[PDB]
């Protein structure tokens, strides 16, 4: 059998920061979504435009698996139609999203005593991201009319900020690993079938 390598996304030992979210393009394989119905492993499993229980009966042109880490209380922003720092400046789903959003608590892997400062999010950006846009700029953010010329100072801020993930955080503020499955159906032969 030629199974789609969803394990490489879901079971990756390390995850990306949300501003630099990872994407794996899945093509030309048999997709077995049975691992999703294994509950007690996922705190969020929400689908849009498809039935969550019928995924094994569906064919798509391609499937995208995006993955990243955010705060628990930010998982609600990974949905069509949402606003907030994550949806606006880090990872944006389209209003007409077709796919599923899966999340689980990763406190045991992604928090550190005194703070894990490796997971970042973009705090400053002049405009919202388009759906599925990925901004990895580290340009100094100009909050006034004076050019920054690459140096931080008043009105001149580094645009990325660290999460302060420590294992004693309240659960809503603990790290969550998120995988977004986008199902792409083009006027073309399907290559990912259940």
């Amino acid at each position, epitope marked *: 059998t030629n199974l789609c390598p969803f394990g490489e996304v879901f079971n990756a030992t390390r995850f990306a920061s949300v501003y630099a979210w990872n994407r794996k393009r899945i093509s030309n394989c048999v997709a077995d979504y049975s691992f999703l119905y294994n509950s007690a492993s996922f705190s969020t499993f929400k689908c849009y435009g498809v039935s969550p229980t019928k995924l094994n009966d569906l064919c798509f042109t391609n499937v995208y698996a995006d993955s990243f880490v955010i705060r628990g209380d930010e998982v609600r922003q990974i949905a069509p139609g949402q*606003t907030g720092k994550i949806a606006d400046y880090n990872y944006k789903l389209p209003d007409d999203f077709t796919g599923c959003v899966i999340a689980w608590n990763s406190n045991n892997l992604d928090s550190k005593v005194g703070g894990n400062y490796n997971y970042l999010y973009r705090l400053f950006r*002049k405009s919202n991201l388009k759906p599925f846009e990925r901004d990895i700029s580290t340009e100094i953010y100009q*909050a006034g*009319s004076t050019p920054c010329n690459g140096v931080e100072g*008043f009105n001149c801020y580094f645009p990325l900020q660290s999460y*302060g993930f*420590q294992p*004693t955080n309240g659960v*809503g503020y603990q790290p969550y690993r998120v995988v977004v499955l986008s199902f792409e159906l083009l006027h073309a032969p399907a290559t990912v079938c259940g």
Partner: antibody, heavy 117, light 104 residues
Framework: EVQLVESGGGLIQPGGSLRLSCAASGITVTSNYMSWVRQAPGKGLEWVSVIYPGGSTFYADSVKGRFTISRDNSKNTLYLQMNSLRAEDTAVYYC???????????WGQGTTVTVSS | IVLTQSPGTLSLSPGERATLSCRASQSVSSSYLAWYQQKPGQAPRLLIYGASSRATGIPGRFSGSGSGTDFTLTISRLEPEDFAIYYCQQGVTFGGGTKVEIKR
């Protein structure tokens, strides 16, 4: 100089409307998280509303559906439209630039709103 | 998120050390807190951001510390202009304030 100059407060009857303005110099309003914070007589500070640099807006539950935050880039000004005002909206209203991780560093001088019949 | 400041009133003399407490109902991020001073008729003034970083131009006698849920503002040696109300802040939440008044 870096300042926020507020205006628009005054006396209004319950159910009426007022518009507060916060004219900025030294920061670009549309490039910032900009907030309104109010303080009722003798009480503490209460966050009221924020507008993000990209335009998303958020409101305290106590003003949702009644207040609208907005901005005008050409005037470099932040606004708060307050509709269906109530007695308990009586307060000094402050605008402030919010750096989120670096605190609210720049504050307006405050404008007083008194809602009474 | 609820921020609880203690005590409600500190009664101290000039030259004495002031210690003000802010406790958060939840551990959020790390060192996630700002401190403000407010005098009658004036707007609040940022003292401390990121729990421990002094805002520009704030005198060195002001220091902040703490993490998780327990945070402290210290005024190492009170000056007469330091008698005032002090607020902590996290996100959209403010503490209830602590008044520093002159003891006699």
């Amino acid at each position: 100089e870096v300042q926020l100059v507020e205006s628009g407060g005054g006396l209004i009857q319950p159910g009426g409307s007022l518009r507060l303005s916060c004219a900025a110099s030294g920061i670009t309003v549309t490039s910032n998280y900009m907030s309104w914070v109010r303080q009722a007589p003798g009480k503490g500070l209460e966050w009221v509303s924020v507008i993000y640099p990209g335009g998303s807006t958020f409101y305290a539950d106590s003003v949702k559906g009644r207040f609208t935050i907005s901005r005008d880039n050409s005037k470099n000004t932040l606004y708060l439209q307050m509709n269906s005002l109530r007695a308990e909206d009586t307060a000094v209203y402050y605008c402030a630039r919010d750096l989120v991780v670096y605190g609210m560093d720049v504050w307006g001088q405050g404008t007083t709103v008194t809602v009474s019949s | 998120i609820v921020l609880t400041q203690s005590p409600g009133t500190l009664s101290l003399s000039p030259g004495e050390r002031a210690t003000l407490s802010c406790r958060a109902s939840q551990s959020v991020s790390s060192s996630y807190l700002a401190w403000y001073q407010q005098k009658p008729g004036q707007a609040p003034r940022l003292l401390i951001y990121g729990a421990s970083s002094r805002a520009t131009g704030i005198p060195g006698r002001f220091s902040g510390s703490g993490s998780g849920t327990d945070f402290t503002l210290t005024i190492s040696r009170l000056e007469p202009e330091d008698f005032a109300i002090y607020y902590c802040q996290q996100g959209v939440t403010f503490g209830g304030g602590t008044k520093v008044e002159i003891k006699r």
